[PDB]
């Protein structure tokens, strides 16, 4: 793991050198915008033109089918010297290892979709109005009662986007004069919501509760930066599970410290609300944390319930305040009615109230599939991140040129994966995420493992001894 | 605390000093091999190629190539963004003592002949002066000031 670092730095330096060399001619053969400033300066997008454009076919692949265990991938064929990949006919059937349907709700199933269609036949796909005006229907009133009695809090609100649920709610809770302490690896919606408020932002080391206390004591003993005024509030923000890393938060230790120093806890659990937990109640049911010890609880309906939107769960007073001062509730358009019927029906299937047993089989299959896959990868020699119970499990690649090689050798043998590189990760740590679904069968996973073994032999990403 | 700036946070992982030295040994071997010459005339080329690249990368360009951080570092060079602006840290000391060591090698192997001694001393003085702790956020006569 030392020669791997040396090779990674060497290859990135080679890319840097060649990109600068080509940029020194491009900006010189332009002498062979009528007073308008350029959209973007030459070096403000260097890695989009010199790194990302080289490996372009590995992203934004169109699909012509529903996002299920198997799907159809359209192929692209650019002619203009690899500038704009445009598509053709003639798809190919691949195995899905890159979508986010953890519980398998992302296609047509025989309970949810028939009820979704008859709600659309009656409410017509949108209300064209906000929730405070004409955007509240019967469906919207029933959805919040369903979310409340599934998350375990006195009250809840539902919004139409999950990025907005962070970036428009955080400004309402804290302002100038307050403090926000954030985990280093929090999502971009949290960071943008924190910047959208006037509060001060400090950060603590990822998932290390002994540094959170060190930051809290130093910030409380000093006060606001130049004028040592007391802080009005402190809010600590964590995530239930971290998808790039695959790991679960140390939530009991965080909640014990926050009570000691009188901070408020904001929990973002979008990759964990349906996936983990014995009855699928998230991280609080798995780690035995009392749900009255967190003040705000947020989630998304995209990863497990096969829909769109987000929610905030808290106390009665919090929700009454938000429904009076929140910009997303006052100014936006309500969540579409056929897209709320989906969440209602998915919660009824999980809770077991559809009069069937499919909701327990889904929860038993997602736990069984991911444990088997993670235990099978580790004995082959791969470096796999994650704890034990997550459904997402990255594989370390480390070398920038091993991203297109891995992706393109998997796709030729009908397996579809996700890879991520530099700008989005640290320099040394490119990886490939694997998302396991409850709709994958046992004889699909054996085929995927057989392909990935061969590809990892060729690329040389078996960094540990086998068994 | 964690760095929170992709433009500098990578410089703390292992293997970076070793790769810095290996690149400079590889460059010397390339200069010797492509155009047969003597060790001194090769260490001079390495010494003066390490000045153009390093000065432009560390002390001339301002800002970051990543646009998420809207423009918060528009007025800072890469050297001034390092370690959040804190002075005389470990990595700053290493980056300061590299041109000094690379100057002695290029002088003792060239027998201190003058045609090259002027250039090899000018490079080192310019490179070391820009890294003084009191030279922070200051531009000379307004050049590269806006």
């Amino acid at each position: 793991m030392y020669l791997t670092a040396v090779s990674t730095y060497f290859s990135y330096g080679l890319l840097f050198a060649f990109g600068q060399l080509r940029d020194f001619f491009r900006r010189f053969i332009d002498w062979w915008l009528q007073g308008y400033a350029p959209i973007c300066l030459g070096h403000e997008d260097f890695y989009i033109r010199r790194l990302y454009h080289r490996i372009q076919d590995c992203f934004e692949r169109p699909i012509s089918s529903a996002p299920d265990a198997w799907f159809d991938v359209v192929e692209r064929y650019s002619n203009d010297n690899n500038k704009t990949l445009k598509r053709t006919t003639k798809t190919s059937r691949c195995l899905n290892l890159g979508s986010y349907n953890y519980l398998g709700f992302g296609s047509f199933d025989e309970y949810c979709t028939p009820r979704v269609i008859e709600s659309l036949k009656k409410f017509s796909a949108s209300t064209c109005s906000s929730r405070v005006d004409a955007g509240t229907t019967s469906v919207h009133a029933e959805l919040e009662e369903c979310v409340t009695r599934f998350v375990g809090k006195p009250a809840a609100v539902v919004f139409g986007m999950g990025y907005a649920t962070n970036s428009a709610i955080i400004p309402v809770l804290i302002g100038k004069g307050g403090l926000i302490i954030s985990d280093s690896l929090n999502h971009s919606s949290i960071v943008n919501g924190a910047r959208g408020s006037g509060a001060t932002i400090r950060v603590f080391q990822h998932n290390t509760p002994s540094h959170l206390e060190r930051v809290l004591r130093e910030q409380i003993a000093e006060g606001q930066p130049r004028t040592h005024r007391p802080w009005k509030k402190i809010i600590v923000v964590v995530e239930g599970i971290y998808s790039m890393e695959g790991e679960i938060c140390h939530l009991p230790e965080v909640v014990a410290i926050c009570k000691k120093y009188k901070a408020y806890v904001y929990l973002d659990e979008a990759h964990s609300i349906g996936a983990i937990g014995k009855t699928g109640k998230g991280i609080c049911e798995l780690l035995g944390v009392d749900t009255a010890d967190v003040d705000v609880m947020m989630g998304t309906f995209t990863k497990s319930f096969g829909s769109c939107g987000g929610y905030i769960a808290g106390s009665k007073e919090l929700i009454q305040y938000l429904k009076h001062q929140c910009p997303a509730h006052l100014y936006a358009t309500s969540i579409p009615t056929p897209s709320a019927q989906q969440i209602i029906s998915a919660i009824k299937v999980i809770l077991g109230e559809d009069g069937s047993n499919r909701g327990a089989q889904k929860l038993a299959r997602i736990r069984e599939n991911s444990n088997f896959f993670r235990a099978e990868l580790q004995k082959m020699g791969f470096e796999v991140l994650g704890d034990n119970d997550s459904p997402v499990m990255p594989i370390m690649l480390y070398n920038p040129a091993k991203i297109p090689a891995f992706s393109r050798e998997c796709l030729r043998q009908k397996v579809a994966v996700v890879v991520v590189g530099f700008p989005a990760t640290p320099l040394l740590l490119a990886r490939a995420r694997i998302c396991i679904s409850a709709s994958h069968s046992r004889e699909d996973l054996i085929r995927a493992l057989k392909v990935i073994s061969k590809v990892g032999d060729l690329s040389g990403i078996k960094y540990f001894p086998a068994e | 605390p964690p760095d929170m700036n992709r433009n500098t946070e990578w410089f703390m992982y292992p293997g970076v000093w070793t790769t810095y030295m290996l690149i400079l040994f590889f460059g010397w071997l390339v200069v010797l091999s492509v155009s047969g010459c003597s060790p001194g005339m090769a260490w001079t080329v390495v010494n003066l190629a390490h000045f153009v690249v390093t000065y432009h990368s560390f002390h001339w360009m301002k800002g970051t190539p990543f646009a998420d951080d809207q423009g918060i570092y528009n007025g800072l060079t890469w050297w001034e963004q390092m370690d959040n602006g804190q002075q005389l840290t470990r990595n700053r000391k290493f980056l300061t003592l590299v041109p000094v060591v690379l100057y002695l090698i290029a002088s003792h192997t060239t027998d201190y002949r003058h045609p090259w001694l002027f250039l090899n001393t000018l490079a080192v003085m310019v490179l070391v002066v820009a890294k003084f702790p009191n030279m922070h956020k200051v531009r000379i006569f307004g050049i590269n000031g806006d």
Partner: peptide, 27 residues
């Protein structure tokens, strides 16, 4: 001449490599 400058520079090296890090003050 050819070995006094080397000592001169070796002195400033050991002066530099002993200082303690610090950060600038506020307003």
């Amino acid at each position: 001449g050819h070995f006094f400058v080397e000592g001169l520079l070796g002195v400033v090296i050991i002066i530099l490599l002993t200082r303690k890090s610090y950060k600038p003050p506020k307003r």
